[PDB]
Structure 1
Amino acid sequence: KSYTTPKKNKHKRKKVKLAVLKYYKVDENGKISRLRRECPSDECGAGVFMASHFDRHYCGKCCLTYCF
């Protein structure tokens, strides 16, 4: 049943409520001015959102990390 080495947990995804509010920035106007950019590759759709990082910009399902 139990073992000696401690079991490392599998990365269960966290619980975030109303997440879309930090993706589409809410300005004064009713325009969806989103700071998250758009992936120029046509293999992935425009809906499929990318990754937001600090020294790079990983794309969607294209597996192309558009670094600086």
Structure 2
Amino acid sequence: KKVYTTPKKIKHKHKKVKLAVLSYYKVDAEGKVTKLRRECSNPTCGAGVFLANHKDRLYCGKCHSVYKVNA
């Protein structure tokens, strides 16, 4: 029977990007290490999970959407 109508606008899904994620720890010569971008305070999160920094925003991604804590 009948077929095929479009306004156009066919979409596409999440980008995910790539880069190379972890360069953020600053290692001084001989030999120690500092941690950029402080980690998260929830008990389900293991102190290796950080807080993304946008604006007004430092927010935890291991707990899915959970507990932006702004500093």
TM-score tier after normalising by the smaller chain length: 0.5 to 0.7
Mapped pair 1:9 → 2:12 = yes
Q: Where does structure 1 lack aligned partners over 5 or more consecutive residues?
A: none
Q: Percent identity, aligned pairs only? A: 45
Larger helix percent: 1
The Cα of 1:57 is off from its aligned counterpart by 0.8
The Cα of 1:20 is off from its aligned counterpart by 1.3
- 1:29-48 matches, within 5 Å, as 29-48=30-49
Q: Where does structure 2 lack aligned partners over 5 or more consecutive residues?
A: none
Moved over 4 A (4+): none
- 1:14-29 matches, within 5 Å, as 14-16=17-19, 18-21=20-23, 23-29=24-30
* Cα root mean square deviation, aligned: 2.4
Q: Give the structure-2-normalised TM-score.
A: 0.64
What SS does the corresponding residue of 2:22 show, helix, strand or coil?
Answer: helix
Larger strand percent: 2
Cα separation, 1, equivalents of 2:68 and 2:28: 29
- How many residue pairs get matched? 66
Q: Give the structure-1-normalised TM-score.
A: 0.66
